[PDB]
Coordinates of N, CA, C and O and ligand atoms in Angstrom, one line a residue:
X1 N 67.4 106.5 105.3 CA 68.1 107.5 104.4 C 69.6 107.4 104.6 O 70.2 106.7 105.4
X2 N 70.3 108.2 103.5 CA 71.9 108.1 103.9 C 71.9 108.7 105.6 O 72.9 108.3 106.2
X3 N 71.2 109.2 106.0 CA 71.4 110.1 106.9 C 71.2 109.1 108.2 O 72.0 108.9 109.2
X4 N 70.1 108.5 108.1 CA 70.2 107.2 109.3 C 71.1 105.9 109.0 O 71.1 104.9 109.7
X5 N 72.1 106.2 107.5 CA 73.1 105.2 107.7 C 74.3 105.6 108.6 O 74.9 105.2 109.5
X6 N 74.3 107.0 107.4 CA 75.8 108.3 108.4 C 75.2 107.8 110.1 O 75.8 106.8 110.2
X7 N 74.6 107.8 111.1 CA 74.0 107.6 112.6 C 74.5 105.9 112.5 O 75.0 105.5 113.6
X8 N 74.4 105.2 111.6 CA 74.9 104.1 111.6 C 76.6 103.8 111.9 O 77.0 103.2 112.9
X9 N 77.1 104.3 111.2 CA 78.5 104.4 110.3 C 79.1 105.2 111.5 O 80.3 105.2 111.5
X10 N 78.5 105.9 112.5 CA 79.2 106.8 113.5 C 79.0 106.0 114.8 O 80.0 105.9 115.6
X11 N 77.7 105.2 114.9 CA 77.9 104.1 116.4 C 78.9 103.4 116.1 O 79.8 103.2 117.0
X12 N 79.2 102.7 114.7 CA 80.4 101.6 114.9 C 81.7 102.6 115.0 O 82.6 102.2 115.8
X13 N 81.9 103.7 114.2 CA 83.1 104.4 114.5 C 83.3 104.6 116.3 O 84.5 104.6 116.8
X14 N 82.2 104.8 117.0 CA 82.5 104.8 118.0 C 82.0 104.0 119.2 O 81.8 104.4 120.4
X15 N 82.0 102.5 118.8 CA 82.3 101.6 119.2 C 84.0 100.9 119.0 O 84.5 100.0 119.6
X16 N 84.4 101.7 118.2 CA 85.6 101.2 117.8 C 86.9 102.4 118.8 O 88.1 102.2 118.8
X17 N 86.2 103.3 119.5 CA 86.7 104.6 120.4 C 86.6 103.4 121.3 O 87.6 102.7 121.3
X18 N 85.8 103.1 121.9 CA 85.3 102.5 122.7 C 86.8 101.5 123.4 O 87.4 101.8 124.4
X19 N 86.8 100.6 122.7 CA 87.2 99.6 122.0 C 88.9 100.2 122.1 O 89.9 99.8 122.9
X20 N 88.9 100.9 121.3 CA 90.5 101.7 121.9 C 90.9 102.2 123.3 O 91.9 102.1 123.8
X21 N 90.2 102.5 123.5 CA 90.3 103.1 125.0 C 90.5 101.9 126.1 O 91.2 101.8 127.1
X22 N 89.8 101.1 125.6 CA 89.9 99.7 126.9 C 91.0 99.0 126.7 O 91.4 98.2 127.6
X23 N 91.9 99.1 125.2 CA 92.6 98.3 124.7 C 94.1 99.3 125.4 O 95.0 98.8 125.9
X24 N 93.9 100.2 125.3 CA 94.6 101.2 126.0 C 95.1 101.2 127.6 O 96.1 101.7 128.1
X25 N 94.3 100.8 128.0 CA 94.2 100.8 129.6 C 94.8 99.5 129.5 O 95.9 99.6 130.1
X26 N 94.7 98.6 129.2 CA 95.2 97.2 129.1 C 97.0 97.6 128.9 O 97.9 97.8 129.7
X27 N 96.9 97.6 127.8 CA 98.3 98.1 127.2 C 99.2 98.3 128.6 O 100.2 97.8 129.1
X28 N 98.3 99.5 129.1 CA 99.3 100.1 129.7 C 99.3 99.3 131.2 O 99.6 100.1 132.1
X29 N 98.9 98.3 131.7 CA 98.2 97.6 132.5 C 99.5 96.4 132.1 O 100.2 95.9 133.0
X30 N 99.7 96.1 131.0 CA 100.5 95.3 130.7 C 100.1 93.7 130.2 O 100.8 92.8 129.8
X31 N 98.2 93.9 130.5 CA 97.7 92.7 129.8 C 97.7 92.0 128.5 O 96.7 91.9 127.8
X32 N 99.0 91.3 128.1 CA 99.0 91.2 126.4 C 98.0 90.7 125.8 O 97.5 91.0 124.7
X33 N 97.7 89.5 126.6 CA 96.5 88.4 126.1 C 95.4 89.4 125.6 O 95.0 89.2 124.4
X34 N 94.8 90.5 126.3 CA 93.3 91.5 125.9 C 93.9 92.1 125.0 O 93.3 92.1 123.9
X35 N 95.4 92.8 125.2 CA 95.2 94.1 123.7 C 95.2 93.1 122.9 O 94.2 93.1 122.3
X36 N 96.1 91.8 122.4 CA 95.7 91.2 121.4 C 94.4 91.1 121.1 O 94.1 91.3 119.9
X37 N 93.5 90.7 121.7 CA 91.9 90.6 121.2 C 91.2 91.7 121.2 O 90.4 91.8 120.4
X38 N 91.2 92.7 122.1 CA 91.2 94.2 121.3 C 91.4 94.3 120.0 O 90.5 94.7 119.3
X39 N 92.4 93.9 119.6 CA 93.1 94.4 118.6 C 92.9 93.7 117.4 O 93.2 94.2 116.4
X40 N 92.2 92.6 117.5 CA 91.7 91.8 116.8 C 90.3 92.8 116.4 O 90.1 93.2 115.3
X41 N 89.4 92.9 117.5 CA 88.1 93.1 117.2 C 88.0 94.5 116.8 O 87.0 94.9 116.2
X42 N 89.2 95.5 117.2 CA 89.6 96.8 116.4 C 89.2 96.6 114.9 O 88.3 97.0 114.2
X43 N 90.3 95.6 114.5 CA 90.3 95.6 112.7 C 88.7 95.0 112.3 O 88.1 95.6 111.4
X44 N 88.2 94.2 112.8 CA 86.4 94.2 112.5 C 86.1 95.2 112.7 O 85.4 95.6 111.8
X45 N 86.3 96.1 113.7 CA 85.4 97.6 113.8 C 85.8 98.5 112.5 O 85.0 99.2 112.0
X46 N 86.4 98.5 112.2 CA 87.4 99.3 111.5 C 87.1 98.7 109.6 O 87.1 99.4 108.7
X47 N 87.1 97.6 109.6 CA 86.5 96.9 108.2 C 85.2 98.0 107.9 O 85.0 99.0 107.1
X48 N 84.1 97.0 108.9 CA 83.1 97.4 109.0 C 82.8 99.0 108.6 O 82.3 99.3 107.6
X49 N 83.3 100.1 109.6 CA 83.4 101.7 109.2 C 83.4 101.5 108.0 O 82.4 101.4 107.3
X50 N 84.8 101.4 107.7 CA 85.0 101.6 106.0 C 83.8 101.3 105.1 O 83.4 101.9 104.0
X51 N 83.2 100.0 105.7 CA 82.5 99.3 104.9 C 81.1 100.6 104.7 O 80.5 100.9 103.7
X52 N 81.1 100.9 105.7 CA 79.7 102.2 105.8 C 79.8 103.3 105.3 O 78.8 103.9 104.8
X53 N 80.9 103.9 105.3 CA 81.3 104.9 104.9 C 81.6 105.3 103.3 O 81.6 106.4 102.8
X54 N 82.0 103.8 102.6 CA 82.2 103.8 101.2 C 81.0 103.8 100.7 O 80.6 104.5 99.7
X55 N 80.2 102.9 101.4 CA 78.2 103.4 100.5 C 77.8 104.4 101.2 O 76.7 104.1 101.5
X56 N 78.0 105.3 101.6 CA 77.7 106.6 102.0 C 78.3 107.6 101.0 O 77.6 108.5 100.5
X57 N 79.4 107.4 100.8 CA 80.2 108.4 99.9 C 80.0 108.0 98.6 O 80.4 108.8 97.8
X58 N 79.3 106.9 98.2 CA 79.3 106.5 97.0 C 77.6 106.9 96.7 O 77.2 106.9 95.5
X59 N 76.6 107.2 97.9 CA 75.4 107.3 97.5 C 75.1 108.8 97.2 O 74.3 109.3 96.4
X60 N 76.3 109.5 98.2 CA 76.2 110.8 98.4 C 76.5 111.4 96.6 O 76.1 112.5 96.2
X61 N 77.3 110.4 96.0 CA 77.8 110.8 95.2 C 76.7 110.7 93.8 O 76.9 111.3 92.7
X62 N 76.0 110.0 94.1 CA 75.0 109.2 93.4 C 73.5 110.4 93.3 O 73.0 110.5 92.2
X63 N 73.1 110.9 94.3 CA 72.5 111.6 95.2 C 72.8 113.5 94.3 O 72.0 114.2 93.7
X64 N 74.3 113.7 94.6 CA 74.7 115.0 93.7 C 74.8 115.7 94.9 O 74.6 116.8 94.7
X65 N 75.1 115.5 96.5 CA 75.1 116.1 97.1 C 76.7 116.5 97.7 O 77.4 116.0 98.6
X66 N 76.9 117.4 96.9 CA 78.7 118.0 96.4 C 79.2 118.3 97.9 O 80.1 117.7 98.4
X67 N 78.4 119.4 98.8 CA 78.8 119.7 100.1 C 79.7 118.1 101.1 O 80.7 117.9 101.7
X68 N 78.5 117.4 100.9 CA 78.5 115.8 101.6 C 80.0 115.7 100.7 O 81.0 116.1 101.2
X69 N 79.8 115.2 99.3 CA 81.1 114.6 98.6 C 82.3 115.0 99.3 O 83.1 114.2 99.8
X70 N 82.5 116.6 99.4 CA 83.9 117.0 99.7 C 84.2 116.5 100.9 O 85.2 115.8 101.2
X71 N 83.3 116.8 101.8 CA 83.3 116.4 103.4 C 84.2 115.0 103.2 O 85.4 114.9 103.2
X72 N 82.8 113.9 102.9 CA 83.6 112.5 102.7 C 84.9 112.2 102.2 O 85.7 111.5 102.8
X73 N 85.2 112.8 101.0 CA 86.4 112.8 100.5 C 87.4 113.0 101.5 O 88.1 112.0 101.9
X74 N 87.5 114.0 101.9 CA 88.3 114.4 103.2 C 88.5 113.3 104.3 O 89.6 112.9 104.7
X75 N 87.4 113.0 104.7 CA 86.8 111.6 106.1 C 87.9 110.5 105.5 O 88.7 109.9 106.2
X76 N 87.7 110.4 104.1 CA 88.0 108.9 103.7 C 89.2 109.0 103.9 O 89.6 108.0 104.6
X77 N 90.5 110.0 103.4 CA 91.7 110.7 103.7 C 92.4 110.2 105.1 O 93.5 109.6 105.4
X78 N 91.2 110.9 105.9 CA 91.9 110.6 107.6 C 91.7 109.5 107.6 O 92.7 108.9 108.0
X79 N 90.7 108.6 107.1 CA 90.5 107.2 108.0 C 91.4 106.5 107.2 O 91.4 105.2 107.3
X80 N 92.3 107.1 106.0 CA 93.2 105.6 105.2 C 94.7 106.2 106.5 O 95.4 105.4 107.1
X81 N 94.8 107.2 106.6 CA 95.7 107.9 107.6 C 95.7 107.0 109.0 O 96.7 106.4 109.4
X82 N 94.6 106.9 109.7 CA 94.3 105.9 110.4 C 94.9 104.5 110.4 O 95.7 104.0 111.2
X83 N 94.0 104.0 109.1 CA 94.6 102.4 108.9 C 96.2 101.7 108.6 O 96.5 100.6 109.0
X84 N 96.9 102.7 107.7 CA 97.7 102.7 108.0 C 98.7 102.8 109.5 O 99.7 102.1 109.5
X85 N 98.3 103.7 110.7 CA 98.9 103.8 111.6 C 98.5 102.4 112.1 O 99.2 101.5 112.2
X86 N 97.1 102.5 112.3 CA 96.7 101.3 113.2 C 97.4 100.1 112.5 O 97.9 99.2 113.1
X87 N 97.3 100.2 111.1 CA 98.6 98.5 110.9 C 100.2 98.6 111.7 O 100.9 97.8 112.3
X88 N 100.4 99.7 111.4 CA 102.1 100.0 112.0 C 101.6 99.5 113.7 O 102.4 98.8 114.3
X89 N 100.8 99.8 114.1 CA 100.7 99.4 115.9 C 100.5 98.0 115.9 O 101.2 97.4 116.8
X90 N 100.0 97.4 115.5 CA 99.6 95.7 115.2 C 101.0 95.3 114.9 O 101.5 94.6 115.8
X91 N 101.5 95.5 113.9 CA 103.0 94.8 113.4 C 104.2 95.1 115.0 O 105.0 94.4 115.6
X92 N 103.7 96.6 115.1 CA 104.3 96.8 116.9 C 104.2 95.8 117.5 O 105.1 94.9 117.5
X93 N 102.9 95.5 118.0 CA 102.4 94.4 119.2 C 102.9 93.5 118.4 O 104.0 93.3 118.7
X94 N 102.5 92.8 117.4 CA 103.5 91.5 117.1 C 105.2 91.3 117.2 O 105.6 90.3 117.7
X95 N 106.0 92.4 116.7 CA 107.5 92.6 116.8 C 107.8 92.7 118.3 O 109.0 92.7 118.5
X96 N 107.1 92.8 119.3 CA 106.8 93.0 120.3 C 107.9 94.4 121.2 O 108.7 94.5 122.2
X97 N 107.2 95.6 120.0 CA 108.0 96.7 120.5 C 107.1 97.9 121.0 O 106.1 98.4 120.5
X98 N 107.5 98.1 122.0 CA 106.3 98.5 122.7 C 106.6 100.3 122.9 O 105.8 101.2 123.3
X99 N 107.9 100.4 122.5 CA 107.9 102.4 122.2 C 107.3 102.4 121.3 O 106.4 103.2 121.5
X100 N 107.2 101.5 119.6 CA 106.9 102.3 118.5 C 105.1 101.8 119.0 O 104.3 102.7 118.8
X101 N 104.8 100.9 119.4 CA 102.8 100.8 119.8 C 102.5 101.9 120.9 O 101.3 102.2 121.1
X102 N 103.5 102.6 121.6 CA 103.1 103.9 122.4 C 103.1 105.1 121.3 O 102.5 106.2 121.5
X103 N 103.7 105.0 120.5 CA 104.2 106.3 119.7 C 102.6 106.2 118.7 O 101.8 107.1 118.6
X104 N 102.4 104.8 118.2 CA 101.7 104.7 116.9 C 99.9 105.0 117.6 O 99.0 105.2 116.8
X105 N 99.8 104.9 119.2 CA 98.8 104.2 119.9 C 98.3 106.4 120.1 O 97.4 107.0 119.6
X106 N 99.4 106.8 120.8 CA 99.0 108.4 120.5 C 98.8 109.2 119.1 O 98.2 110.3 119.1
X107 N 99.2 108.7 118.2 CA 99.2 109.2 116.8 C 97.7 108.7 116.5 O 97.1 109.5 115.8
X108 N 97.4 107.8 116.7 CA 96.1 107.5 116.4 C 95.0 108.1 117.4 O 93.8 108.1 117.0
X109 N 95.4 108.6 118.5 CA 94.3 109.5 119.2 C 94.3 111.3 118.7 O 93.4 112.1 118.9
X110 N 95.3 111.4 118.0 CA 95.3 112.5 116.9 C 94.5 112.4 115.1 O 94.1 113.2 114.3
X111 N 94.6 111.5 115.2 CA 93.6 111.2 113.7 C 92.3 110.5 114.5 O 91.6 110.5 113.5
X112 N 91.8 110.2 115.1 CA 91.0 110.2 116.0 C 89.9 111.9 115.7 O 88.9 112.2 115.2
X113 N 90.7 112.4 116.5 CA 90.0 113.6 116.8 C 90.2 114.7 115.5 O 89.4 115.5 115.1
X114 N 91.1 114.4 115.0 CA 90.4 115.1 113.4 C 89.7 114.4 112.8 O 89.0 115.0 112.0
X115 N 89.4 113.1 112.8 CA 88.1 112.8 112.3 C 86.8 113.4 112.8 O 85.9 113.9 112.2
X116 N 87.2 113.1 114.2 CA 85.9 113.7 114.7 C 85.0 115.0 114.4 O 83.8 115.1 114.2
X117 N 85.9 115.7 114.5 CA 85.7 116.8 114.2 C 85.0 117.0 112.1 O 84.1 117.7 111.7
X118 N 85.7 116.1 111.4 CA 85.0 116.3 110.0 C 83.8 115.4 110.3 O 82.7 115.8 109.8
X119 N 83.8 114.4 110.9 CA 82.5 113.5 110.7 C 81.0 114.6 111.7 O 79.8 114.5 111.5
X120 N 81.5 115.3 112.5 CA 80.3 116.3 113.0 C 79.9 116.7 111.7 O 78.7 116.5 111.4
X121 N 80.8 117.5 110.8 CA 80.1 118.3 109.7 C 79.3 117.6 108.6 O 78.2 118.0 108.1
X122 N 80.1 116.3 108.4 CA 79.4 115.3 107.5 C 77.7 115.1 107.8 O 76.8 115.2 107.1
X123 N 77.8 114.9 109.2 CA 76.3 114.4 110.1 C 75.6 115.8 109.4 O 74.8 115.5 108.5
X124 N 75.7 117.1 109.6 CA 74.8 117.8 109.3 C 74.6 118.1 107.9 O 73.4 118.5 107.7
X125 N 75.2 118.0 107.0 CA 75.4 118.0 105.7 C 74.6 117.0 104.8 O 74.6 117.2 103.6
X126 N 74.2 116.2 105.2 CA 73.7 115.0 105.0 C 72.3 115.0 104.7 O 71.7 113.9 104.5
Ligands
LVF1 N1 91.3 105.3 113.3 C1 91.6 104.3 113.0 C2 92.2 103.0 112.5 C3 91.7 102.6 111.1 C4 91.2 103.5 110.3 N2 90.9 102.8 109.1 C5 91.1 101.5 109.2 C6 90.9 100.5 108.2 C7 91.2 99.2 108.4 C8 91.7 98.9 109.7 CL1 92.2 97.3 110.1 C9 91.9 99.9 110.6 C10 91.6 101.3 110.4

């Protein structure tokens, strides 16, 4: 059902937590070689979401299930909020400037956790 994809669409979202967190500890560890491939396998985690998330919002929408729509609508909001930041941290690590990938690396643990928080409601709504 959409509802065992939304369970889908939330392990890769948080395999991609995952995935930041270790990339994180590196960072600050000073290992460039890993956050680069972190950071690689970030933007596949992060495709991927999107990729689950738009046939969810699009079935939900298909479906008539208005509560779900708004929720998603909102979700899809933070996670372009997200992708954005997370490109500004990439073009960081490449320019090789390492205040604005600390600034852009916390900003993203803030859209993080407001996701979090709408994707609980999504899960029940569903
Ligand atoms: N949270 C977070 C980062 C992120 C959200 N949406 C994204 C879409 C694409 C790429 Cl590469 C990255 C992201």
């Amino acid at each position: 059902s959409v509802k065992s994809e939304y369970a889908e669409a939330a392990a890769v979202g948080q395999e991609a937590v995952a995935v930041f967190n270790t990339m994180k500890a590196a960072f600050q560890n000073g290992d460039k070689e890993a956050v680069a491939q972190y950071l690689a396998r970030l933007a596949s985690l992060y495709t991927r979401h999107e990729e689950l998330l738009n046939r969810i919002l699009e079935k939900a929408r298909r479906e008539g299930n208005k509560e779900a729509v708004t929720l998603m609508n909102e979700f899809t909001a933070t996670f372009q909020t997200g992708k954005s930041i997370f490109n500004a941290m990439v073009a960081a690590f490449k320019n090789g400037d390492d205040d604005s990938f600390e600034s852009y690396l916390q900003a993203l643990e803030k859209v993080t956790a407001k996701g979090e928080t709408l994707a609980d409601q999504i899960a029940k709504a569903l």
